[PDB]
Amino acid sequence: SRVRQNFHPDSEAAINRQINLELYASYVYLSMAYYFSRDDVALNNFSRYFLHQSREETEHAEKLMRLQNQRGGRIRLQDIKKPEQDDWESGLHAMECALLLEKNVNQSLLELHALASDKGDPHLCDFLETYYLNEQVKSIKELGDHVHNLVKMGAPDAGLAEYLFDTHTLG
Amino acid sequence: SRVRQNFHPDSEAAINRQINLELYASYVYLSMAYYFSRDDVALNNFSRYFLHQSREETEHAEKLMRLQNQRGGRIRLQDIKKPEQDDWESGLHAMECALLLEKNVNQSLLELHALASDKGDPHLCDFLETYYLNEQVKSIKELGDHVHNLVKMGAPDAGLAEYLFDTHTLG
Amino acid sequence: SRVRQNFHPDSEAAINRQINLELYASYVYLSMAYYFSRDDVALNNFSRYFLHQSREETEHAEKLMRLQNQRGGRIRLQDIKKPEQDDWESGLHAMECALLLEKNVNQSLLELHALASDKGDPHLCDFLETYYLNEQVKSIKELGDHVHNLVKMGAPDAGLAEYLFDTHTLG
Amino acid sequence: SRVRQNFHPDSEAAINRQINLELYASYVYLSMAYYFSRDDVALNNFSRYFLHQSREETEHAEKLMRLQNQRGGRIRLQDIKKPEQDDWESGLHAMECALLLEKNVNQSLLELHALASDKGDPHLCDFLETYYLNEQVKSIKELGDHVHNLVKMGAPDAGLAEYLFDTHTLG
Amino acid sequence: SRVRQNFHPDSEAAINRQINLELYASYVYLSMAYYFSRDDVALNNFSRYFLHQSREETEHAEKLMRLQNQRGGRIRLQDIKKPEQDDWESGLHAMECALLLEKNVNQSLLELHALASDKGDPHLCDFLETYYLNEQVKSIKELGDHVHNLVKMGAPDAGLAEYLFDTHTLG
Amino acid sequence: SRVRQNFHPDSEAAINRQINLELYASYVYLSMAYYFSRDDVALNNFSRYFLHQSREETEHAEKLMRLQNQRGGRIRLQDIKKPEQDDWESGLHAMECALLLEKNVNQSLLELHALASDKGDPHLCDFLETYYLNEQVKSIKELGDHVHNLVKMGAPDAGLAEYLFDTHTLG
Ligand SMILES: [Mg+2]
Ligand SMILES: [Mg+2]
Ligand SMILES: [Mg+2]
Ligand SMILES: [Mg+2]
Ligand SMILES: [Mg+2]
Ligand SMILES: [Mg+2]
Ligand SMILES: [Mg+2]
Ligand SMILES: [Mg+2]
Ligand SMILES: [Mg+2]
Ligand SMILES: [Mg+2]
Ligand SMILES: [Mg+2]
Ligand SMILES: [Mg+2]
Ligand SMILES: [Mg+2]
Ligand SMILES: [Mg+2]
Ligand SMILES: [Mg+2]
Ligand SMILES: [Mg+2]
Ligand SMILES: [Mg+2]
Ligand SMILES: [Mg+2]
Ligand SMILES: [Mg+2]
Ligand SMILES: [Mg+2]
Ligand SMILES: [Mg+2]
């Protein structure tokens, strides 16, 4: 590529793996969004919250695809795996799964950063630091806050918990 | 499901297959969008055109997921297969592939409609007719128009063809 | 902490020490602010300048406290030591002390960054780089500019120096 | 001091002690604010409520520092002691601690007023009456209201209590 | 310098070399701008494009000069070498030269970053990452896009190529 | 050149020399601008004044480059020599140097005009008279005014002189 410079093939490959992971995260959140709009779950603000998260993940994927093109790398897409469950059980369970998902994605981003550092790619490092790492920290913290409140409120067994959390925190 | 009424398990299953196909179409268009922003392709309006198509397909999938929930069906997601190519060759080739993709999706929607008709599900029939069938016809016609103009202009070999089409028609 | 990830206990501890240092810097500037509003000093723009610096330091402390919470660390507060003097002698002396204070705080932030780098915490590194390091450089440069002008003008002995600097530069 | 008039050295000293106490109160509230934004507490309106209280206490300190300067007294700062706890246990416990803190600060202000009265300093008396005494009464009453509601609601053990109080009363 | 801190003489020197390189890049683009406004070239949008690039390079130089002053380094200017050619041959050739120029400048910035990293200067690293590295990547990508389109269109020999590119892409 | 008319090769050459001189003047002023923003000089309005002069000189160069193209001449760039000093000593010294620089540039413009007159090029004469000669006279007069005031005020030794001149005249 006539634009390629200081861009290691390993970094290129890792960015393609990260693109897939971001699309996967988007899919997991899309699945959660629609679980909450089932007639037997019907927590509309949980639904909207996860739908919004899904859309943010798609943008995470797109920024990485754009990065690949900017650096002269070549996007290699792979199947986007379906989420682990179609039935997310409860608002609390979905939040705990989302928290695990974000920590796993964060671990992947940190490994990508370590690789970029090892390959002396400050541009890639800065890209990750600028658009991903703090976003992950904020997301993990937010999900943690949500999990804590849902647990304290008595979800999923306390009948008013998820309903009130949906209406107040996610409203 | 306490909301389920006149909703055949076969229709429920076919809607889940259609949801997957729509997500797949979205993925194909996302792939095309980013192929056109490669430094060695760089047709930005082809890129924007396909990105927009990708986003429309996601909405097609979401409406079907919403339909499933409204009718009391249960969404069962499957892996979203990667597109057939990562290198779409040219603006003309991508348009021809998009045309084939839309005809295939249309065939699937027509089969879904025939099933819905066979199962006496006027609501599903109307849903398909209202949000999908004419949309497909318009999309297929538009792609056909584009393919014709690109071919006539001499794409992909005539150096000015895709460039001019990108700037005038897709601009 | 269910949100904690890649956050070394040493980094957590260093952030708590930095929080204290920022609160201390805020206190030093608060002390300076009110020294300049004494009836026998009465340089109101020096007073306002330092009060503003004091408030900025409090925000520096708060961002670190927020960082601690985001990362899952636990804030451990310590006494905020009183400033070294209650009588800051002159506008020049206060500016020289502020310069020393900012260089000391900068050294602390650089040590924190080195620790974060050693612990492979790019998020913490980026946090420091984004909100602290350049802020320190700008502050040190500004104070240096002020010290130079006050010295050149003849402060503290030249009767018109601090008065004119207060009215023109800090006004 | 050429501005000093009818200002007893004992009053000057007591004002310096009060300045310290106000800074201490500010610190206690800052600590509480950030306890409520921990991922395992996550009551954001309790956090905002206490942060606001913290900022009000800083202004209480500043008004006393300004008073000292106006009267010709000399500000003598002392270490600001860290709060008694870093872990405030619960929204109810933090409110009860805040109530105790405000009653203690009020006792200090009343002793200051008695001293000012004994020294025949009507200006100081009026200053205390105007900016501090009623503020304390209003604060103590508000905290009392909050403590009562939290207790009645079943905090800290009733899972919905602090959550609902955070969203309704402190929202 | 009383503001100097953690600023290695080697970094200071490298920043002075980079300042010169940025001024040189500005000069190359100024030369290109005016080549395109020759009566026998007359591609006004190529002219405007390069003039704009020239002005951006001057700002790149100024930010580095400001950095030098902020850190306490001393700016040492050197002759700004004239560009390699006064006759840039064609719109395609000028774009290819600009691409080479930007890759060379990027290599220099990456070497500066490696030096700053070796000297443990996170502030300098962050400065480069924040204002230079991604800017270079975006510029190189843009030039690559332009080169690709001009080549595909048949520039410089196809009479309509540069003319159409000037009017559509650079317009 | 098919546009060339009544344009002597000597005039073409002299315009190229003048272009270089204008770029040189711009560089001298850029150097001065950043000397005044050193932490040990810190006269920000002197800095802004010279930066503005630098930018005006660049426009002087550009107008001559445009003139060359309009007349059918060919721009031949040469190295832009670095300024005689990096340390401009004082606000007064920089102003005296600027005055000498402008008188030297004016002498060059007057020689260019004499050449243009000798070659019977009224267009070139008028161009010089319209955009350069009076501009030089105004600039020389302004610098003279500044030098006089700085000298009278006691610069560079009188500590308040440059500071007050910076704040009042150049503010
Ligand atoms: Mg993501
Ligand atoms: Mg599988
Ligand atoms: Mg780094
Ligand atoms: Mg960075
Ligand atoms: Mg579709
Ligand atoms: Mg396969
Ligand atoms: Mg119908
Ligand atoms: Mg600070
Ligand atoms: Mg002590
Ligand atoms: Mg960073
Ligand atoms: Mg108080
Ligand atoms: Mg103690
Ligand atoms: Mg009374
Ligand atoms: Mg009264
Ligand atoms: Mg540059
Ligand atoms: Mg040479
Ligand atoms: Mg950075
Ligand atoms: Mg000039
Ligand atoms: Mg020389
Ligand atoms: Mg005339
Ligand atoms: Mg004045």
Side-chain angles (χ1 to χ4, degrees), chain A residues 1-75 77-171, chain B residues 1-75 77-171, chain C residues 1-75 77-171, chain D residues 1-75 77-171, chain E residues 1-75 77-171, chain F residues 1-75 77-171:
Chain A
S1 180
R2 59 169 67 89
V3 305
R4 196 191 189 110
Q5 184 168 30
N6 195 38
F7 193 50
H8 201 286
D10 294 355
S11 298
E12 179 178 359
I15 284 158
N16 279 324
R17 292 192 297 276
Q18 191 64 37
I19 287 168
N20 189 257
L21 186 56
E22 301 290 347
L23 294 168
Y24 171 76
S26 175
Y27 202 20
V28 171
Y29 285 128
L30 175 67
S31 176
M32 287 177 182
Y34 283 85
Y35 164 75
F36 287 98
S37 55
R38 282 171 49 156
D39 71 272
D40 60 0
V41 178
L43 291 178
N44 297 343
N45 287 315
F46 272 80
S47 178
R48 292 185 254 274
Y49 175 78
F50 288 124
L51 188 56
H52 176 72
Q53 298 314 313
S54 175
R55 292 164 179 181
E56 289 186 323
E57 294 306 333
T58 297
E59 179 51 44
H60 293 176
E62 288 196 59
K63 286 196 168 55
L64 280 154
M65 294 171 78
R66 175 180 169 70
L67 170 75
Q68 193 72 286
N69 280 343
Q70 295 174 307
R71 295 298 296 274
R74 291 293 171 252
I75 298 163
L77 299 178
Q78 294 302 336
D79 292 352
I80 302 168
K81 289 296 201 294
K82 67 180 189 181
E84 291 289 304
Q85 321 181 203
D86 279 294
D87 177 350
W88 295 100
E89 302 170 54
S90 71
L92 171 58
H93 187 65
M95 285 291 180
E96 293 185 321
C97 289
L99 175 56
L100 178 60
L101 169 68
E102 300 278 8
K103 297 196 84 175
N104 285 161
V105 175
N106 197 31
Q107 177 56 33
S108 178
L109 290 161
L110 290 171
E111 293 172 348
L112 221 177
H113 190 286
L115 173 63
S117 298
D118 286 347
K119 297 307 186 189
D121 193 332
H123 175 264
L124 175 55
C125 286
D126 168 81
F127 166 93
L128 294 172
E129 283 167 60
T130 305
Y131 307 101
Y132 297 72
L133 304 182
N134 187 52
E135 280 309 305
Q136 279 315 104
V137 165
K138 289 184 304 179
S139 297
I140 290 162
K141 173 59 162 60
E142 173 168 289
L143 289 170
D145 287 0
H146 291 351
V147 170
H148 168 67
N149 277 282
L150 284 164
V151 171
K152 175 61 174 168
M153 295 167 80
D157 289 359
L160 300 179
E162 300 194 340
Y163 178 88
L164 289 173
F165 188 82
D166 172 278
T167 212
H168 296 118
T169 300
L170 304 180
Chain B
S1 180
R2 59 169 67 89
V3 305
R4 196 191 189 110
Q5 184 168 30
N6 195 38
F7 193 50
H8 201 286
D10 294 355
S11 298
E12 179 178 359
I15 284 158
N16 279 324
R17 292 192 297 276
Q18 191 64 37
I19 287 168
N20 189 257
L21 186 56
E22 301 290 347
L23 294 168
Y24 171 76
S26 175
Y27 202 20
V28 171
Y29 285 128
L30 175 67
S31 176
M32 287 177 182
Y34 283 85
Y35 164 75
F36 287 98
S37 55
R38 282 171 49 156
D39 71 272
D40 60 0
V41 178
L43 291 178
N44 297 343
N45 287 315
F46 272 80
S47 178
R48 292 185 254 274
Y49 175 78
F50 288 124
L51 188 56
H52 176 72
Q53 298 314 313
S54 175
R55 292 164 179 181
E56 289 186 323
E57 294 306 333
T58 297
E59 179 51 44
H60 293 176
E62 288 196 59
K63 286 196 168 55
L64 280 154
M65 294 171 78
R66 175 180 169 70
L67 170 75
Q68 193 72 286
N69 280 343
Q70 295 174 307
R71 295 298 296 274
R74 291 293 171 252
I75 298 163
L77 299 178
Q78 294 302 336
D79 292 352
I80 302 168
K81 289 296 201 294
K82 67 180 189 181
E84 291 289 304
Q85 321 181 203
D86 279 294
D87 177 350
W88 295 100
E89 302 170 54
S90 71
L92 171 58
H93 187 65
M95 285 291 180
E96 293 185 321
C97 289
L99 175 56
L100 178 60
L101 169 68
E102 300 278 8
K103 297 196 84 175
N104 285 161
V105 175
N106 197 31
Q107 177 56 33
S108 178
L109 290 161
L110 290 171
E111 293 172 348
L112 221 177
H113 190 286
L115 173 63
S117 298
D118 286 347
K119 297 307 186 189
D121 193 332
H123 175 264
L124 175 55
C125 286
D126 168 81
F127 166 93
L128 294 172
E129 283 167 60
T130 305
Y131 307 101
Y132 297 72
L133 304 182
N134 187 52
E135 280 309 305
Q136 279 315 104
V137 165
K138 289 184 304 179
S139 297
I140 290 162
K141 173 59 162 60
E142 173 168 289
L143 289 170
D145 287 0
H146 291 351
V147 170
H148 168 67
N149 277 282
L150 284 164
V151 171
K152 175 61 174 168
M153 295 167 80
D157 289 359
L160 300 179
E162 300 194 340
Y163 178 88
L164 289 173
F165 188 82
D166 172 278
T167 212
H168 296 118
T169 300
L170 304 180
Chain C
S1 180
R2 59 169 67 89
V3 305
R4 196 191 189 110
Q5 184 168 30
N6 195 38
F7 193 50
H8 201 286
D10 294 355
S11 298
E12 179 178 359
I15 284 158
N16 279 324
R17 292 192 297 276
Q18 191 64 37
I19 287 168
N20 189 257
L21 186 56
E22 301 290 347
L23 294 168
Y24 171 76
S26 175
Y27 202 20
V28 171
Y29 285 128
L30 175 67
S31 176
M32 287 177 182
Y34 283 85
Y35 164 75
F36 287 98
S37 55
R38 282 171 49 156
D39 71 272
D40 60 0
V41 178
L43 291 178
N44 297 343
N45 287 315
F46 272 80
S47 178
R48 292 185 254 274
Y49 175 78
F50 288 124
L51 188 56
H52 176 72
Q53 298 314 313
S54 175
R55 292 164 179 181
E56 289 186 323
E57 294 306 333
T58 297
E59 179 51 44
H60 293 176
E62 288 196 59
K63 286 196 168 55
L64 280 154
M65 294 171 78
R66 175 180 169 70
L67 170 75
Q68 193 72 286
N69 280 343
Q70 295 174 307
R71 295 298 296 274
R74 291 293 171 252
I75 298 163
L77 299 178
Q78 294 302 336
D79 292 352
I80 302 168
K81 289 296 201 294
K82 67 180 189 181
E84 291 289 304
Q85 321 181 203
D86 279 294
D87 177 350
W88 295 100
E89 302 170 54
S90 71
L92 171 58
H93 187 65
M95 285 291 180
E96 293 185 321
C97 289
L99 175 56
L100 178 60
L101 169 68
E102 300 278 8
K103 297 196 84 175
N104 285 161
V105 175
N106 197 31
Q107 177 56 33
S108 178
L109 290 161
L110 290 171
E111 293 172 348
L112 221 177
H113 190 286
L115 173 63
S117 298
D118 286 347
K119 297 307 186 189
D121 193 332
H123 175 264
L124 175 55
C125 286
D126 168 81
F127 166 93
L128 294 172
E129 283 167 60
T130 305
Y131 307 101
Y132 297 72
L133 304 182
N134 187 52
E135 280 309 305
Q136 279 315 104
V137 165
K138 289 184 304 179
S139 297
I140 290 162
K141 173 59 162 60
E142 173 168 289
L143 289 170
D145 287 0
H146 291 351
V147 170
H148 168 67
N149 277 282
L150 284 164
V151 171
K152 175 61 174 168
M153 295 167 80
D157 289 359
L160 300 179
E162 300 194 340
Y163 178 88
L164 289 173
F165 188 82
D166 172 278
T167 212
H168 296 118
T169 300
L170 304 180
Chain D
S1 180
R2 59 169 67 89
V3 305
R4 196 191 189 110
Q5 184 168 30
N6 195 38
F7 193 50
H8 201 286
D10 294 355
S11 298
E12 179 178 359
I15 284 158
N16 279 324
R17 292 192 297 276
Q18 191 64 37
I19 287 168
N20 189 257
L21 186 56
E22 301 290 347
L23 294 168
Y24 171 76
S26 175
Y27 202 20
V28 171
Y29 285 128
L30 175 67
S31 176
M32 287 177 182
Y34 283 85
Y35 164 75
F36 287 98
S37 55
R38 282 171 49 156
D39 71 272
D40 60 0
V41 178
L43 291 178
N44 297 343
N45 287 315
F46 272 80
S47 178
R48 292 185 254 274
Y49 175 78
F50 288 124
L51 188 56
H52 176 72
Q53 298 314 313
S54 175
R55 292 164 179 181
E56 289 186 323
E57 294 306 333
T58 297
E59 179 51 44
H60 293 176
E62 288 196 59
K63 286 196 168 55
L64 280 154
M65 294 171 78
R66 175 180 169 70
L67 170 75
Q68 193 72 286
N69 280 343
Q70 295 174 307
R71 295 298 296 274
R74 291 293 171 252
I75 298 163
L77 299 178
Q78 294 302 336
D79 292 352
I80 302 168
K81 289 296 201 294
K82 67 180 189 181
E84 291 289 304
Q85 321 181 203
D86 279 294
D87 177 350
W88 295 100
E89 302 170 54
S90 71
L92 171 58
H93 187 65
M95 285 291 180
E96 293 185 321
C97 289
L99 175 56
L100 178 60
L101 169 68
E102 300 278 8
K103 297 196 84 175
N104 285 161
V105 175
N106 197 31
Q107 177 56 33
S108 178
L109 290 161
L110 290 171
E111 293 172 348
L112 221 177
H113 190 286
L115 173 63
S117 298
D118 286 347
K119 297 307 186 189
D121 193 332
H123 175 264
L124 175 55
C125 286
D126 168 81
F127 166 93
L128 294 172
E129 283 167 60
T130 305
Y131 307 101
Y132 297 72
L133 304 182
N134 187 52
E135 280 309 305
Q136 279 315 104
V137 165
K138 289 184 304 179
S139 297
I140 290 162
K141 173 59 162 60
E142 173 168 289
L143 289 170
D145 287 0
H146 291 351
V147 170
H148 168 67
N149 277 282
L150 284 164
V151 171
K152 175 61 174 168
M153 295 167 80
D157 289 359
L160 300 179
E162 300 194 340
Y163 178 88
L164 289 173
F165 188 82
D166 172 278
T167 212
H168 296 118
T169 300
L170 304 180
Chain E
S1 180
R2 59 169 67 89
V3 305
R4 196 191 189 110
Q5 184 168 30
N6 195 38
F7 193 50
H8 201 286
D10 294 355
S11 298
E12 179 178 359
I15 284 158
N16 279 324
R17 292 192 297 276
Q18 191 64 37
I19 287 168
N20 189 257
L21 186 56
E22 301 290 347
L23 294 168
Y24 171 76
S26 175
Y27 202 20
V28 171
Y29 285 128
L30 175 67
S31 176
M32 287 177 182
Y34 283 85
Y35 164 75
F36 287 98
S37 55
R38 282 171 49 156
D39 71 272
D40 60 0
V41 178
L43 291 178
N44 297 343
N45 287 315
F46 272 80
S47 178
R48 292 185 254 274
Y49 175 78
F50 288 124
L51 188 56
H52 176 72
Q53 298 314 313
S54 175
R55 292 164 179 181
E56 289 186 323
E57 294 306 333
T58 297
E59 179 51 44
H60 293 176
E62 288 196 59
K63 286 196 168 55
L64 280 154
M65 294 171 78
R66 175 180 169 70
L67 170 75
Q68 193 72 286
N69 280 343
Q70 295 174 307
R71 295 298 296 274
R74 291 293 171 252
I75 298 163
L77 299 178
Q78 294 302 336
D79 292 352
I80 302 168
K81 289 296 201 294
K82 67 180 189 181
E84 291 289 304
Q85 321 181 203
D86 279 294
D87 177 350
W88 295 100
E89 302 170 54
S90 71
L92 171 58
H93 187 65
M95 285 291 180
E96 293 185 321
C97 289
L99 175 56
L100 178 60
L101 169 68
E102 300 278 8
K103 297 196 84 175
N104 285 161
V105 175
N106 197 31
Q107 177 56 33
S108 178
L109 290 161
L110 290 171
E111 293 172 348
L112 221 177
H113 190 286
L115 173 63
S117 298
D118 286 347
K119 297 307 186 189
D121 193 332
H123 175 264
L124 175 55
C125 286
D126 168 81
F127 166 93
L128 294 172
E129 283 167 60
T130 305
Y131 307 101
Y132 297 72
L133 304 182
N134 187 52
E135 280 309 305
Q136 279 315 104
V137 165
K138 289 184 304 179
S139 297
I140 290 162
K141 173 59 162 60
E142 173 168 289
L143 289 170
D145 287 0
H146 291 351
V147 170
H148 168 67
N149 277 282
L150 284 164
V151 171
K152 175 61 174 168
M153 295 167 80
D157 289 359
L160 300 179
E162 300 194 340
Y163 178 88
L164 289 173
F165 188 82
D166 172 278
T167 212
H168 296 118
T169 300
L170 304 180
Chain F
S1 180
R2 59 169 67 89
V3 305
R4 196 191 189 110
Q5 184 168 30
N6 195 38
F7 193 50
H8 201 286
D10 294 355
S11 298
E12 179 178 359
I15 284 158
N16 279 324
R17 292 192 297 276
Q18 191 64 37
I19 287 168
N20 189 257
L21 186 56
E22 301 290 347
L23 294 168
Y24 171 76
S26 175
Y27 202 20
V28 171
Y29 285 128
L30 175 67
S31 176
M32 287 177 182
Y34 283 85
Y35 164 75
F36 287 98
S37 55
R38 282 171 49 156
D39 71 272
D40 60 0
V41 178
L43 291 178
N44 297 343
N45 287 315
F46 272 80
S47 178
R48 292 185 254 274
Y49 175 78
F50 288 124
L51 188 56
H52 176 72
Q53 298 314 313
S54 175
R55 292 164 179 181
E56 289 186 323
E57 294 306 333
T58 297
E59 179 51 44
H60 293 176
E62 288 196 59
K63 286 196 168 55
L64 280 154
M65 294 171 78
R66 175 180 169 70
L67 170 75
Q68 193 72 286
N69 280 343
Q70 295 174 307
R71 295 298 296 274
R74 291 293 171 252
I75 298 163
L77 299 178
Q78 294 302 336
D79 292 352
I80 302 168
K81 289 296 201 294
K82 67 180 189 181
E84 291 289 304
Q85 321 181 203
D86 279 294
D87 177 350
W88 295 100
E89 302 170 54
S90 71
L92 171 58
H93 187 65
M95 285 291 180
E96 293 185 321
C97 289
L99 175 56
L100 178 60
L101 169 68
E102 300 278 8
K103 297 196 84 175
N104 285 161
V105 175
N106 197 31
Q107 177 56 33
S108 178
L109 290 161
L110 290 171
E111 293 172 348
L112 221 177
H113 190 286
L115 173 63
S117 298
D118 286 347
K119 297 307 186 189
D121 193 332
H123 175 264
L124 175 55
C125 286
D126 168 81
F127 166 93
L128 294 172
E129 283 167 60
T130 305
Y131 307 101
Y132 297 72
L133 304 182
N134 187 52
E135 280 309 305
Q136 279 315 104
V137 165
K138 289 184 304 179
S139 297
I140 290 162
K141 173 59 162 60
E142 173 168 289
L143 289 170
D145 287 0
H146 291 351
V147 170
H148 168 67
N149 277 282
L150 284 164
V151 171
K152 175 61 174 168
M153 295 167 80
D157 289 359
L160 300 179
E162 300 194 340
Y163 178 88
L164 289 173
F165 188 82
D166 172 278
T167 212
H168 296 118
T169 300
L170 304 180

